[model samples]
Target: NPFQFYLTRVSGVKPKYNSGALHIKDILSPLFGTLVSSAQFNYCFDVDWLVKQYPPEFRKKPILLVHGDKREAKAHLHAQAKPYENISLCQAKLDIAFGTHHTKMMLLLYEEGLRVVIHTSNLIHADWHQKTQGIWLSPLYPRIADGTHKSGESPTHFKADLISYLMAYNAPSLKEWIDVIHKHDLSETNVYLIGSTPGRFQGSQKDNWGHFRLKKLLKDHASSMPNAESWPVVGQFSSVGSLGADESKWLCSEFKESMLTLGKESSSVPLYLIYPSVENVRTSLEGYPAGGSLPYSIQTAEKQNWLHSYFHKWSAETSGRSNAMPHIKTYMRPSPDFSKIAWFLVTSANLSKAAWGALEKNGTQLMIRSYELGVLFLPSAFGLDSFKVKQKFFAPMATFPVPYDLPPELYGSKDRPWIWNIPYVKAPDTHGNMWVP
Candidate 1:
């Protein structure tokens, strides 16, 4: 009787991932012309594949966060189910710099780990204050009082100064950061690396090797201490022509050459390639000159396949099957397969000349586990498996477009040639006020 009552009571609770239906007519008819419609169909097919293989429960509860700086606070806020007050110096400063732009922070917290009283701001935030609860940690001073810009503060200066301050405070470079991370001992966490720019190891020149200091620190820690765990690397791919022929050529060549050198150096570090645009992927993939051991092939065939197979198989049999669906589910079922994936890290660097700084200056950030070494902790309800499985799906999806809707110009301008160019506009002020070049 009780079982019957429970089933009846929960009957209306349909899985969020597969809420809508596809009409036979829509599937049969051409809604957006032939080629476009076919593209749409492929998109639907991908969605379907994602759904059938991954159920709704596997996707929703645990979300992903990607950033260039101290975007962790925002990530924490978005992860919470119910709206609640958030305490974050990074977020507060960001909000002040941009003025009412909470979306960046909010998006990160949309579906956080689980129930908790508050979330830590992680390293950048920690580096900002003498202690986590220090007085000067207020967003106002660092954002407004700082004497960088005449008007409030300059976002660019604020960011640079923050980095400088952290370094001066004996904050770790990329390597030191990782060392501190291990010193705190949070290895074995499922980590993800997102780069808007390429890394030093990826064929970047001296100045372009922005994270060289950090990399060295991590190397020292890895060698001397031996955390006995590994982390995964994924990056946005860059192309030629889109940013400019020179820029693209530089990036493509550097990245193309870098992958060749990536062999056997670090077994723990695996790189996944994700480009923001098709042109980027196409150009980068093509630039390498059809040959043996292409980087794109390495990612698409090996790295991505491994991640996909692991999650697909696990989600299919685990309790969190539904969450595995890309955009379908609301809650992820529990996954026993995720024991291997405990922590993940994300950033805004890419695998190209510009990302690595061989071509120009850029910014990047790194995130590691929090709770173990006094960084941050996954909430008790935070489903670790949910994070791994969803990432397995979404990481590849990043290389392609969303496949949902197309802007009007995308269709109308199909007959015309598209031009790509990069601009050296004025950087943002310390307070994040954008100015014209």
Candidate 2:
């Protein structure tokens, strides 16, 4: 399944699942072919636990790219990984004060084939089991015959973009994997790579990454939608950053402007933000623990009180993940009736200026701190070849396999967003544990 949530391994709830949903073990299965080598990019790494998830045959072939420039954690990761000689770990360079290596992706090389997996889970046990997450598995790209053909990367420039991103790291550990990508034919994969890298990008280099990159893609491709102004943009995420005092401060100005097609300066499309309410988290499958990763602090919430009106509850009843509590971040603009979507993004990037850049130096330079990665599913690329997202034309019924329900349930008058730093004393969660901050 290309765009779908990971199946919860929680017993008793096993029967209530989508057949096509993914499991972590399935991604590591040798059924795809013998894994030659792989590189994992994530925010954290529990080397001992994660290595066991792989089939025995491929245990030593993975290189882990992790975050956190800590001596103790790095030593722990290295010591734990010492048993497996080929399994390497490298701490990515985070330039900004609070930036992180939050991008979650995998590059796998099989015998004469390659597959790219872009997802929303860290390399830890808790993230794999109970929580809700999203994953996109690219088709198996084959090797060129005779090894003489040039890498004429096509479909969506995914291969080329990936190479560029990997090279940006300038690390010796990734060179072998980068070379592995150049020899494969990735024209079979049909999605655009929307990514974020750490830099204060300027001039022509500015539009090469982050939200600015997404804005350019939407401008060129999403122009065919009919009455485009009416299609509301739904943004669902796990955290909220300090997005200034009022709406005009980056949130309403730059971020909102990019979501709409054609860069309509005056035409405003309804932007709905889907974040869990305190009640939603308190009643989840894992209760308060489900709200752990949703680190939208009480401090940030206080600054953006104007965001209250745009909040929607984390409603995923249709996909059976309502109570799982979403760590998956998705953005889509579905038809007003919720029949078809113009574009859907399953990303590690959340609703923060840090993940999806903000303009600085009077909008001349784009400043991005964290490393984020995601794939876009455009109607033109998925299945139908000739289908155009116009007023008359559409993708059969629904093309995007959205994790949440259509016509998202808006938060009621009494609902407030779940801010983890604040103590919740009014009620105990499902597990009878009241949050004490």
Point to the candidate with the largest lDDT: 2
Off by over 4 Å in 1: 1-183, 190-249, 264-347, 350-354, 359-437
> Where is model 2 more than 4 Å wrong at Cα?
1-16, 263-266, 382-398
What is each predicted model's overall lDDT from 0 to 1?
A: 0.21, 0.78
Enumerate residue pairs that collide in model 2.
none
| lDDT: worst 10-residue window of model 1 | 1-10
User: How many Å off is the CA of 116 in candidate 2?
Assistant: 0.9
Cα-based lDDT at residue 404, candidate 1: 16
Q: For each candidate, give its TM-score against the true structure.
A: 0.25, 0.92
